[PDB]
Amino acid sequence: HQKEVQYEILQKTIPTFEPKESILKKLEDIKPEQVKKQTKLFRIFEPRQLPVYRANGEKELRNRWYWKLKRDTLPDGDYDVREYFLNLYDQVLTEMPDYLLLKDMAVENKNSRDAGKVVDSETAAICDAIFQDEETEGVVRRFIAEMRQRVQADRNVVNYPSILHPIDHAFNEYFLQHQLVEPLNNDIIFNYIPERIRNDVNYILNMDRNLPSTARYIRPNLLQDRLNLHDNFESLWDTITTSNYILARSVVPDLKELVSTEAQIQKMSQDLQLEALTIQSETQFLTGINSQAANDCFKTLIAAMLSQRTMSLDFVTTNYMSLISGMWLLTVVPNDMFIRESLVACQLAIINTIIYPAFGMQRMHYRNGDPQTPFQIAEQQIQNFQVANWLHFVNNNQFRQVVIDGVLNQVLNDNIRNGHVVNQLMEALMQLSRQQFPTMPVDYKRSIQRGILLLSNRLGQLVDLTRLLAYNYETLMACITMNMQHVQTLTTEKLQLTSVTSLCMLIGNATVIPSPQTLFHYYNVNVNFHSNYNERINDAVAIITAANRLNLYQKKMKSIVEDFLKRLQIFDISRVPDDQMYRLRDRLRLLPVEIRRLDIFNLILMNMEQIERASDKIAQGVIIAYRDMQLERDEMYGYVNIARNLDGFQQINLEELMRTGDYAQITNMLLNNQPVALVGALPFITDSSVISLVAKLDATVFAQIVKLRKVDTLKPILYKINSDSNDFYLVANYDWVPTSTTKVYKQIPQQFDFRASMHMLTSNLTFTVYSDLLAFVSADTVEPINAVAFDNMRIMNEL
Amino acid sequence: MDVLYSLSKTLKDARDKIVEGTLYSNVSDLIQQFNQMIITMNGNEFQTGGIGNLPIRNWNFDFGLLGTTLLNLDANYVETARNTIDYFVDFVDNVCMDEMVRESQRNGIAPQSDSLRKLSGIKFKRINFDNSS
């Protein structure tokens, strides 16, 4: 009960999904980055006809074209406007196309006299409206009627006329000029295959497909970890190695043609003579010896090495057959793949039950925390060359590090790869079978020596097994794309030494290597995970940097980090400790923004002011000038109390006033009628009544600021006086200058200009994007009887 | 030598470019290089100067990274950068002086001072960047 409680306390801090096996599905459902195609030109603005007024305020007989926001949804308050533009940034990033083919958006120009086409249908509508307009210049009309697309199929190029606002043109031009599709040919596919698989003669790779020159693909982003999750993220790294271990388990091949369990079990029982002993556990000695355990051991060892997930050793000390098998396990598997306590426990059991008793040595009084393992002490304390040399190998058989194709790999000593070191193990244990065991009761000594010989007499099978294990490890490691970082993980995979015994006593001579399709699937899942990891890092970094550069100081980067972890697909975010979440935020802040996202953000940041000032529902401020200022004469309003700028007034930032809560300066200025300019995104009332201006109602709207100590209900009056006002005759039939004491800081819409809006958009005529590159490869394998290792000899040679 | 030059060049860039009001895009690559330099030098002890009247100076590096989140640099950013830069400039000047006053008949091209010998280690090669002089 207690042990489960403490282990649950630990496991609640690890974001691994509790049914480990189900993680496989979550890893296999990660797809390549979704390819986005543009169906229409990106537009924030549209042309619109608006009424205009003469200087006297009379509505003219013609409308004028102006650029307006297609969706005018801007909020009030500067902070909320910046939030709006962060949301716009996210929208652009999510809808950003990976490639464009303008011909899909090419429609007919109704007024074309030369079979002309334009992109897109919105351009067609605008061009028709301009063509019909009576105020259009004859040269513009003739050009609309004559402007031509150019399709060059030989060059795979298209050019179309488009009408776009300059900001919309910038977005679409960036999309056209920075597409993610590269030319795809057989050389790129062939190089996509891992190099160590292209060089293994056990696999036959062919290219039986012709790619057209129009073939395209999107390169995966296989950048190595910029967050260094193997450093100081214990829970996250534990989850990463667990998920990798599950995947590697899925791809390790199943063993074939094992030794009959009945025969080997009877052989082991006859040799060990356990019934004739006095062991308190007679039945348990040979339990856990079967084909299922041997296959599980094979999978566990290869997958644990592939994922660099730490292993613990679970064994019964009295089971010396398990310890004899553990001798082989420590011979072939690097000692650093095990948790220190388990390695020390197994070595100390081997020393104090088998090896030191064999040589008559005093049992090792080992001390926990010793920089030397029990085997490192034994190597110095043992004089026999067979045992000392095998011990020396075990003491130094740690993973070697090597970078291949930019991927860090944990590789084995060559004596493991060719299986020669098993001979040394054999030598050592043959010596142990000849030893006297001075004080040992003879029946127990005979049993120990016969179990030693049970492992010893499988020398050929063990060499074959070591070579098979190493070859499978190397072939599967060729498919790894992220650096194999070695860290001692919080939790381990528990490996039974009885399963090691099953593998050692039951392996035959049937070679099993990964299937080419298994290798391609493993590599594809690794690539998809790596690419998704990089893309989610880039998305998180882009949003964090945008929020900071947009001065979104109430934004919680924790939600961003949680979304990033959730999109990585392998983390239960509820079990991520807070310190690691904050460390993740800190490391994400330090990374630079990816070029495409940063360019989109720069476009948005540079055009923010223009977009915000185009909105019809927010003004940029209000000047309270307690002097009488003449209403401006604007073509868009008639008479309007509009301020072009804020020159000549002290500015109170409304966002700062809202945040501080300190209304002393604003209250003092309003009480004393001190001229001021309140700056910030404000909703305004459009008042068309001359009587309202004569009543001076625009000066009546600020006192609620002092009453409530709020600024989120401030709605200044923007007068709009023209011939459409019901009381306009007062302006027309009397001698007086319409004035007000307040002005609204707002901008005037930009006029549509055909010359500044007409662009030629260029793209490719047509191509096909492909995603599954390895689907273009025909992949066969040799007969497993003929499979060879790195040394060109057969993986298994006992035949 | 390449590492000492890279330190000096990074510091000169930081002095010339980390200025109040400047767009962060003007400094982003430099900020990355500077943070790399800080990370590499953190936790390292150096001793310069025990020859002639050159005084013994001990150097310890425990500095925070510069921020990346601003749009334009402000006074706070510049002050933190300036304190770190001042310490690093003092260290580089002392290392250069320590190397300039030493000579060897056998391997006079190789580094002579202990600090430059330490900086020749692989754990500092990350500092290395544009060698344009």
**Tokens 């996509």 sit on residue:** A192
- For residue A592, the chain B residues in CB contact (below 8 A) are 28, 32, 68
**Long-range contacts for A89-94 (Cβ within 8 Å, ≥24 apart)?**
A89/A542, A89/A543, A89/A546, A89/A600, A89/A601, A89/A604, A90/A543, A92/A42, A92/A171, A92/A600, A92/A604, A93/A539, A93/A542, A93/A597, A93/A600
In three-state secondary structure terms, A67 is strand
> Rounded to whole angstroms, how far apart are CA atoms A305 and A297?
12
Handedness of CA B37, B40, B44, B46 (dihedral sign): negative
Q: How open is the CA angle A386-A392-A394, to the nearest 5 degrees? A: 105
**A551 interfacial to chain B (CB closer than 8 Å):** yes
**A592 interfacial to chain B (CB closer than 8 Å):** yes
The total of structural domains in chain A comes to 1
Q: At what angle do helices A578-590 and A516-549 cross, to 10 degrees?
A: 80
Q: At what angle do helices A291-307 and A497-506 cross, to 10 degrees?
A: 110
Resolution in Å, one decimal place:
2.4
Q: How many CB atoms lie within 10 A of CB A573?
A: 14
Helix (H) or strand (E) holding B108: none
**B57-60 and A676-682 as β-strands: parallel, antiparallel, unpaired?**
unpaired
Handedness of CA A560, A566, A571, A575 (dihedral sign): positive
**A619-630 and A676-682 as β-strands: parallel, antiparallel, unpaired?**
antiparallel
- Main-chain dihedrals φ then ψ at residue B111, nearest 5 degrees: -60, 145
Identify whether A727 is preceded by a cis peptide bond (ω within 30 of 0): no
| CB distance A395 to A381 below 8 Å | no
| Cα–Cα distances in angstroms (integers) from residue B43 to residues A232, B37, B49, in the given order | 17, 12, 20
Cα of A243 vs its chain's centroid, Å: 15
Q: What is the dihedral of CA A68, A74, A77, A83, to 10 degrees?
A: -120
| CB distance A328 to A463 below 8 Å | no
Measured between CB atoms, which of B28, B65, B67 is closest to A592? Answer: B28
CB contact under 8 A, B68 and A592: yes
**Tokens 């049970």 sit on residue:** A454
Which of A38, A593, A523 lies closest to A248 in space, CA to CA? A523
> Rounded to whole angstroms, how far apart are CA atoms A139 and A118?
18
CB contact under 8 A, B69 and A549: yes
Which of A589, A519, A654 lies closest to A194 in space, CA to CA? A519
- Main-chain dihedrals φ then ψ at residue A287, nearest 5 degrees: -70, 155
Q: How many CB atoms lie within 10 A of CB A159?
A: 17
Which of B116, B131, B126 lies closest to B32 in space, CA to CA? B126
| CB distance B61 to B83 below 8 Å | no
**A215-218 and A181-183 as β-strands: parallel, antiparallel, unpaired?**
antiparallel
| Token pair listed for A365 | 């009084």
Cα of B132 vs its chain's centroid, Å: 17
Q: How open is the CA angle A74-A76-A82, to the nearest 5 degrees? A: 65
CB contact under 8 A, A548 and B28: no
Cα of A715 vs its chain's centroid, Å: 45
Handedness of CA A498, A499, A500, A504 (dihedral sign): positive
- Return all residues near A438 (Cβ < 8 A) that are at least 6 apart: A360
CA within 13 Å, CB half, A689: 10
Alpha helices in A507-647 (DSSP H): 516-549, 557-567, 578-590, 595-614
CA-based nearest distance B70→chain A, Å? 6
The 8-class DSSP code of residue A550 comes to T
- For residue A549, the chain B residues in CB contact (below 8 A) are 24, 69-71
Q: What DSSP string runs through A443-496?
A: HHHHHHHHHHHHHHTTHHHHHHHHHHHHHHHHHHHTT--S-------SS-EEEE
Rg (CA), chain B: 16
Per-residue buried b or exposed e for A313-349, using 16+ beta carbons within 10 Å of the residue's own CB: bbbbeebbbbbbbbbbbbbbbbbbbbbeebbbbbbbb
- Candidates B30, B69, B70, B122: best to mutate against A (most CBs of A within 10 A) is B69
- Return all residues near A291 (Cβ < 8 A) that are at least 6 apart: A255, A258, A261, A502, A506
| CB distance A602 to A550 below 8 Å | no
> Rounded to whole angstroms, how far apart are CA atoms A744 and A623?
6
Which of A253, A292, A314, A293 lies closest to A469 in space, CA to CA? A253
> Rounded to whole angstroms, how far apart are CA atoms A739 and A698?
11
| Token pair listed for A270 | 């006859």
Cα of B4 vs its chain's centroid, Å: 7
Q: What DSSP string runs through A605-635?
A: HHHHHHHHHH-SS-EEEEEEEEEEEEPEEET
| Cα–Cα distances in angstroms (integers) from residue A140 to residues A135, A146, A420, A540, A759, in the given order | 10, 10, 85, 46, 14
Q: How many CB atoms lie within 10 A of CB A644?
A: 12
The 8-class DSSP code of residue B24 comes to G
| CB distance A206 to A179 below 8 Å | no
The 8-class DSSP code of residue A155 comes to T
Per-residue buried b or exposed e for A256-270, using 16+ beta carbons within 10 Å of the residue's own CB: eebbebeebbeebee
Q: At what angle do helices A234-251 and A291-307 cross, to 10 degrees?
A: 130
> In which order are the strands placed within the sheet that holds A642-643?
A642-643, A739-745, A619-630, A676-682, A651-653
- Main-chain dihedrals φ then ψ at residue B28, nearest 5 degrees: -55, -55
| Cα–Cα distances in angstroms (integers) from residue A630 to residues A627, A635, A641, A642, A719, in the given order | 10, 16, 8, 10, 12
Which of B1, B13, B2, B33 lies closest to B89 in space, CA to CA? B13
| Token pair listed for A403 | 């970078």
> Rounded to whole angstroms, how far apart are CA atoms B43 and B62?
6
> Rounded to whole angstroms, how far apart are CA atoms A746 and A618?
8
**B70 interfacial to chain A (CB closer than 8 Å):** yes
CB contact under 8 A, B71 and A551: yes
The 8-class DSSP code of residue A338 comes to B
**A209 interfacial to chain B (CB closer than 8 Å):** no
| CB distance A687 to A696 below 8 Å | no
Which of A135, A134, A138, A106 lies closest to A119 in space, CA to CA? A106
> Rounded to whole angstroms, how far apart are CA atoms A673 and A792?
95
Helix (H) or strand (E) holding A354: none
Q: How open is the CA angle A786-A791-A797, to the nearest 5 degrees? A: 45
- For residue B65, the chain A residues in CB contact (below 8 A) are 590
Which of A89, A233, A74 lies closest to A541 in space, CA to CA? A89
Q: What is the dihedral of CA A703, A704, A705, A708, to 10 degrees?
A: 140
- Candidates B71, B73, B126: best to mutate against A (most CBs of A within 10 A) is B71
Helix (H) or strand (E) holding A418: none
In three-state secondary structure terms, A101 is coil
> Rounded to whole angstroms, how far apart are CA atoms A406 and A483?
8
CA-based nearest distance B117→chain A, Å? 26
Please name every residue paired with A403 in a beta bridge, in sequence order, or none if there are none: A408
Q: How many CB atoms lie within 10 A of CB A400?
A: 12
Handedness of CA A100, A770, A212, A198 (dihedral sign): positive
| Cα–Cα distances in angstroms (integers) from residue A31 to residues A34, A239, A606, in the given order | 8, 20, 35
Q: How open is the CA angle A416-A421-A427, to the nearest 5 degrees? A: 160
Q: How many CB atoms lie within 10 A of CB A690?
A: 21
> Rounded to whole angstroms, how far apart are CA atoms A165 and A160?
16
Domain interval for residue A582: 1-799
CA-based nearest distance A79→chain B, Å? 16
CB contact under 8 A, B32 and A592: yes
Residue A182's identity, in one-letter code, is: E
> Rounded to whole angstroms, how far apart are CA atoms B99 and B91?
12
Alpha helices in A728-770 (DSSP H): 729-732, 754-757
Which of A772, A653, A790 lies closest to A211 in space, CA to CA? A772
